[PDB]
Amino acid sequence: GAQVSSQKVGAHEINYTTINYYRDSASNAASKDFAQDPSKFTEPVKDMQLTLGNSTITNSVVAYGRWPEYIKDSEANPVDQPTEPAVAACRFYTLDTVTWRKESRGWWWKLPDALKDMGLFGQNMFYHYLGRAGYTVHVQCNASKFHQGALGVFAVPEMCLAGDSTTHMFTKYENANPGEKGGEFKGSFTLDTNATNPARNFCPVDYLFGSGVLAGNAFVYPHQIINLRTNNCATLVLPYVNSLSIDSMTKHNNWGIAILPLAPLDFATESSTEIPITLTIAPMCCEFNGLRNITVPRTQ
Amino acid sequence: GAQVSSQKVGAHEINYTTINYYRDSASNAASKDFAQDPSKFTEPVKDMQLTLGNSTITNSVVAYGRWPEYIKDSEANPVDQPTEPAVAACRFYTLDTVTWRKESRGWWWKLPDALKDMGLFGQNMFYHYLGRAGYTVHVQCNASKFHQGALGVFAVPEMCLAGDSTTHMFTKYENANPGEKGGEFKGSFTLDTNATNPARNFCPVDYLFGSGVLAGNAFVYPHQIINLRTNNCATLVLPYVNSLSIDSMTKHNNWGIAILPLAPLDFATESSTEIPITLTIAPMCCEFNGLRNITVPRTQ
Amino acid sequence: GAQVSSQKVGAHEINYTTINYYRDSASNAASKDFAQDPSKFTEPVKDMQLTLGNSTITNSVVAYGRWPEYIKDSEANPVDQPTEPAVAACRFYTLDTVTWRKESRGWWWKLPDALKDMGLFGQNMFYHYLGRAGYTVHVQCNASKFHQGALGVFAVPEMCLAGDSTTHMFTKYENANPGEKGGEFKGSFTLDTNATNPARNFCPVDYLFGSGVLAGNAFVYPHQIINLRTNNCATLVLPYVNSLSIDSMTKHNNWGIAILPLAPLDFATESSTEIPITLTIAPMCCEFNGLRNITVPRTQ
Amino acid sequence: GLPVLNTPGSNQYLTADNYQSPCAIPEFDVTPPIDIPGEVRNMMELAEIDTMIPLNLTNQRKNTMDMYRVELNDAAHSDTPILCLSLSPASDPRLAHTMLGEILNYYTHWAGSLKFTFLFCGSMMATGKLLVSYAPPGAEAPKSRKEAMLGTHVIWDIGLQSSCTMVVPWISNTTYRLTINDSFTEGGYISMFYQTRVVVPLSTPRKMDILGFVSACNDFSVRLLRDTTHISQEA
Amino acid sequence: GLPVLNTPGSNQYLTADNYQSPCAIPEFDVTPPIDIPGEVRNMMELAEIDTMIPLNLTNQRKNTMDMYRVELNDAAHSDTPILCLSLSPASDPRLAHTMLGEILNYYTHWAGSLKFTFLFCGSMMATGKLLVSYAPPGAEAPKSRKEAMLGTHVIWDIGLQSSCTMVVPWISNTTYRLTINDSFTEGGYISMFYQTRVVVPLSTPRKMDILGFVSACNDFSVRLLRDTTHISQEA
Amino acid sequence: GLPVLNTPGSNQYLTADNYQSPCAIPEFDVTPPIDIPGEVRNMMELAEIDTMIPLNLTNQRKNTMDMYRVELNDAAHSDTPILCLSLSPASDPRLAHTMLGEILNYYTHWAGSLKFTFLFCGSMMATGKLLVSYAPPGAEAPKSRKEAMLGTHVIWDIGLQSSCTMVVPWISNTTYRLTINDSFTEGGYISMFYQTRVVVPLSTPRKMDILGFVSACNDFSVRLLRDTTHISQEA
Amino acid sequence: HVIQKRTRSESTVESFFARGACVAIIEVDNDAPTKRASKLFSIWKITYKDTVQLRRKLEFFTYSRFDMELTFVVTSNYTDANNGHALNQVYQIMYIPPGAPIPGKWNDYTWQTSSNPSLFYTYGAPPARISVPYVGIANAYSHFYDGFAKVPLAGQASTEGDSLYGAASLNDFGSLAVRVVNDHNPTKLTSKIRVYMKPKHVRVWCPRPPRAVPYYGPGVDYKDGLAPLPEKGLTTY
Amino acid sequence: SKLFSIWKITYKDTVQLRRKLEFFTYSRFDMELTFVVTSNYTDANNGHALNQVYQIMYIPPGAPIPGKWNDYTWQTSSNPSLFYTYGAPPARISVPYVGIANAYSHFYDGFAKVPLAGQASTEGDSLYGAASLNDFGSLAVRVVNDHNPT
Ligand SMILES: CCCCCCCCCCCCC/C=C/[C@H](O)[C@H](N)CO
Ligand SMILES: CCCCCCCCCCCCC/C=C/[C@H](O)[C@H](N)CO
User: Fold this and answer.
1) What is d(CA C218, CA C155) in angstroms, rounded to the nearest whole number?
2) Ligand 2 atom nearest to H60, measured from its CA
3) Which alpha helices (H) appear in F77-196, and where do they start and end?
4) Would you tell me how many other CB atoms lie within 10 Å of the CB of residue C74?
5) Nearest CA distance, B298 vs chain E (angstrom)
6) Cα F98 to chain centroid, rounded
7) Which of B162, B287, D193, E148 could link D131 by a cystine bridge, Cβ 3.0 to 4.6 Å?
8) Superkingdom of this entry's organism (chains D, E, F)?
9) Whose CA is nearest to atom 14 of ligand 1?
């Protein structure tokens, strides 16, 4: 059972044979213009009015070109019946509005963490052992034609943020899951030296994107730019991304949302100018498994 | 996929098998009268009046039997549109006439260096990043039937000339690119010992052909002999020769022209006799790429 | 391309495979009654009057059963036209007659050395760089029915004779090429101790056959016996034998003739009895190449 | 047994070899894969993603967000450059640490066209025309618009388009350029100039920022994988 | 595993071996070749190119251009040789450093015919007849025209032809000659003589130069590649 | 790679092995052979050539020509042997150094018939009858004609034939005999006797010589190649 | 008439270069790093111009294109009798392509060789061997380059725009870093790695006359042996 | 101490194979060469040594002959060279028939030179039976390792 493959000859003066000797395939040797070869990695658009449940919204990227979907029967690990709340949980929830000033270094949120106290979605999340959902994130920021500024919105799978102490991986659960308030990036790294009552919080540096990588490369993640001269809003459609078909929503945050001011806010000649940014997130294709008594995580 | 090849048996008392085990072909083992077997290496002739552009000339070798040609689309590295001046640049330019005496040790020139200040060809050469051209070199030397002497004209690809100092490869750009005046071979090697203001010039010894090789073997290069008793002139048709399909004409000289007196000039009984040698070079199949502001190399 | 050969089984309780791995066949492994199996090595006879040129002669062996022949075009090393004198050189020449006594230890000659001064054959031999010829050697020795004695005539290819000094291979050209007089074997080895004027001659011991081999085995060479009670003469037909198709006749002697008394000469009751032995040699299928001025080797 | 002969190279360990080895965990029931979004097949797929260029690497801007912003204003027209770059995507400090530069610093040879994009982040009431020029190497690097205009160039109407894209086509003597600073394979020069000036009305910011992105085109390739200089391990 | 037996020669390194080895740079995308003029397939192709013979290796001419020129004049006829050469293309000092000699000094055996060409570089008003002789070895080397004329020879009318070509045909006892000085495989002798004398009219140079070239014919072959003695490295 | 297991015998060097090895001179153009007369394919071809027997190895004859001659005379008839030999073609001193003996001394086993020839070198006027006898071993070696006549024998009329040939047929207990002196594989005895006497007329030599030759027949074979004792190298 | 059955098989450009020529002798030591006279790692700029024989053979032609087979013969010895003995050594040969970090210590991070091809050789094993394809950035290797890497422009000072004549990045193939992986024994050991280079699958263009005087540097310069030819009479056979 | 050795290739340094070959006048064959390498300490003190590597370079007639154990000739750019590691199985290589004639001459009844009339007794002299038919070059052998203290 010999495999006769062809070689690619370079310097000329053409087939090579390979035979597998082991039953386990892990023992085998390795076999080896503007158009984007990886069209799915260049933030493909949905190519209006988005209605989910009883919520309606009137610049849309699909992360990795993959729309949210339910678990295939071929890839279902759990065996118990899945709860699908449907319109009850799959609807747009509006988080607390943040304020963009000339001095803002950026904001961040975690999903599903930011929606843990959002109507029936939070109830289903805390009542079940396993949960899964994609998202539609709508960032809203409007300003006059005389305002200038640009925001970069990034959806990062496994958005791990650096700590603030010499102790590695020391950020406690409460500070890593702030909820809908989220957190803010910082312009510099400040080390927490309070060995008695350590803050045990993140210290996400903006130009390091909070994880030791240059912010300029954050555009490799699914992203959208809100340039105030052009558009008001940004829509990101995030499919469920994980190494598992379904996981624990309380333990693990599948996505992170980062908003960084790429161009600082400015207006006329008023040094005092602030415009709100409003996030509206709708979970999509929710499904839960493992119903039992409700989880009540520790707070503060 | 075994390869069964035949052996050539010598001492008799007949096939050997070979199999390639690696995907990369570089891993493979090696597979192994007057008529000239290498007809192209014995200076083949063009087998009158040569007209190029608006220039006409009334003993012609084609170097390596390869006529000048334009780049094939199959072998084009640059992607921008190529400039082909045509008759504007492809025409015969006459360099400064040199004087052949009884004491001359020879002359040398570099191409395209010798034509850098020749009409529109020089302008195109200095305006573009990449340039390519073959040549027709016409050496002219006429004398009476009572003169005796022989000149060897050699076209050398990559004609690198030895320096004049203990420092290796120390000849500066200005001395390596003299232009249409060219340079002269010497009868002996003189070491430049001026450590304060080194000449940084070549010291081409004639019998060493200026590169540490015996001059007698220079006939392996494309060549033509002007024997005063037989012919007046010599025509050499040089194709573009390089490891690249197109290169920088300012950085790199593709050809070198060497004229050596094989038999010394002599006449009647006048020890004072001199005859001119005139070079007329026409670039052929010129093409240029990478237009930008003009290059102005440093001089003197 | 496997070779499946058969084994010859001995002790029984049958094919073996071999594959050549190298392109060069030198790398291969080895593949492996009165009637004489080597009929050609047992001195085959010509199974009268022999006429060659203008010479006629009225017990004939063909050495190795191979008649003299001209060079095949398939095996011709030299490229210039071959001179074939024909009847001019191919004829019987009679050397000086020697005397067989009761005390003779034997005689030897070299071919073509013995015929170097024989008419036009010698002229052709010394005028050409290369020469080739077979021979017909006719040894003649007649005696009454009351004489008893036996001679062994041997034709030896590359008949190298031992020297007479402690210095190896010290026999000089003049002594190694005596001409038609030849030389005589000796009954004992005498060392030349004249370090001032060494003889630089052979010392061929008869029972050692002059080359360190027992004379009894000399019958492996082409040979013929002249037994006085039976026959008068012996004819040996020698083809050209050499590692080359043609060689230098002045440098190299292709054959040697040795005549040894196998049974000593005797007659009636006369202790003083001598009978002549006459050699008549005809070169055959002569061909010469490389004509130039005549060679004149040093003598005495 | 079978007669064999050990050729040179036997018992060596080449870290780039490709051989079979026994399995330490035979008959392991491997977890099947799932359809995870975002699969990468080639590193040039990542090299083709636009990432922001740290153009403004001044003393006070480097290692901050401000290094990504180039300031335009409404001053009177001038021929002085707005920014100047060298086409050394792996060794130029402003391009080395971009995603393209990071990928290139793992390889020794690169070839293909490049795609530069510039985003204007002023007010909608701002207007202006700029010139983005690429000059192939060999001549003096362009010092004014008069020289940069002689090379390849695009004219960008910021009032009309917020983004401009210029392709730097592959033009090289060699078939590949080295990923280091090398004179013989230098890539040329890139510059930006005011074509007209930037014009704003009253009550409008007179100073605004532009951002730069660089990516590879689909004809881009690299060769000779090598260790990068962008990461090191002390002790 | 498969039973194997290590034959003698295992673990040796033969510099002339031909074996496969792993690739240190797998999956390298090689630059394709282009049609460069002047491709060589065999070294005998270079050995067949005429190159000038340094015939005049006297004390004051050797290691100068003058070593390539042999002086003829219009003196009265004589039978003395103009030049004398030995057919030892690899070991004869006048032939060793020609291209043919350089190639031969990389091999141990050579065979085939040779081609000598002589170019006359006098005035067109000069006339004369010469004799170029090759004598196969074995006899005394020719000392006058009377002897050289008995071997192979050509008569050259310089007034008619500026160039003369003589082929020295392959005539040898052995099938190959050694590339060293060896009596048993000596190649013979070559010489030039005045057939008539050189005649010039008045107002003409009475002394002129001839040049010599040697090449191999198409029946020429070499064997047993070996290191040359023409290059050495001190320390 | 392929799993292999090194069997015993690996890395040994057997001087009688038969293995492939790399060529130190690849692509060598070998000189083709020519049809040289006298090609040998087997050593038994040489063993089948008659060579003279040193029969008379007395003190004063050994290591001279006289050792090859046996003297007959015209004395009155007697039953005493003329010569006596042992059928030990490799170890008998009178047969060991013949070509047959030389070839046999390179092998350990021999078998097949032998051919003895005797040449009479007297005058043509001499007459006589002889008896050549071979006696297989086991009994007392024949001391007179009365005993030798009981074994195999031929009668030779020297007046009629100058040469006589006797075949000693292969008769042995074992299928092969050792090439040394061994009692268990002894070959028997050979002798010559006067049947009548030798008669010469007056004026004729009364003493004459006979010569002996020994060769192998075509049914002769040898086995187990071995080093010979007939050649040695001091230091 | 003669049947001319002689072939030119051994004079093909493939057979001409079908040999392993030594181009480098790299010396390394296994010793305590406190010792300052011992070199614990060695860097060799890959080239064929450290030796003359293969260089002269290659410079018969102007351009070449071939794969390269590298063989490594490693020898070692004790530098002292006392101070005990040593166990079998392992050698790391890391290929550093131009741009990759160059080790500064014998044990720094660069030896991780996560991306650089590395060859680990055990002393006493048969000589190591690897193959490389044609890796030139041009379409052929340039044995000669009649030009400069820089063109000095008018106006810039004499210090700027200066480059060596005939030097280009066409021959920049990186280097080889060699070290002994073992920790030092109480006795100092000295090792030499000999690098043998064989061109295979060879093509050549533009034949040139061979070098006639001693090589002087990486260029075509000559200084000393400028009288290669001996004395021989014009009419002396 | 002799750091390198040169051996003129021949079969006449020993007698057994020579005697077997000289049963015949002419021969034609390929040749298999096997190399058995042995080594020993010449002293007990002065420490020990590491495994040795041997270079065997074939020098065909005409190729430069090494004069030092470490001169340029050992580059072996063109000469076939065999590198052997001590303790490995005996090295082995094959050679085709490499005679300049059509067969090997075990005997040559002649001279390489013919002395001509007139030239002095010193000239034209060559050994009897010696010809370049048996000139096969030599083998140069060295230890590649630098010297141990022993
Ligand atoms: C894996 C560690 C062992 C070392 C691996 C070596 C790989 C690098 C070697 C290739 C570079 C040389 C390629 C050939 C270049 C020649 O020297 C010249 N250019 C020939 O003209
Ligand atoms: C690669 C290095 C190892 C040594 C390589 C040896 C190659 C040279 C050996 C061939 C020369 C001998 C050829 C046979 C000649 C015989 O000794 C006699 N002529 C037999 O008659």
Assistant:
1) 9
2) 8
3) 93-96, 99-104, 145-148
4) 12
5) 32
6) 6
7) D193
8) Viruses
9) G68
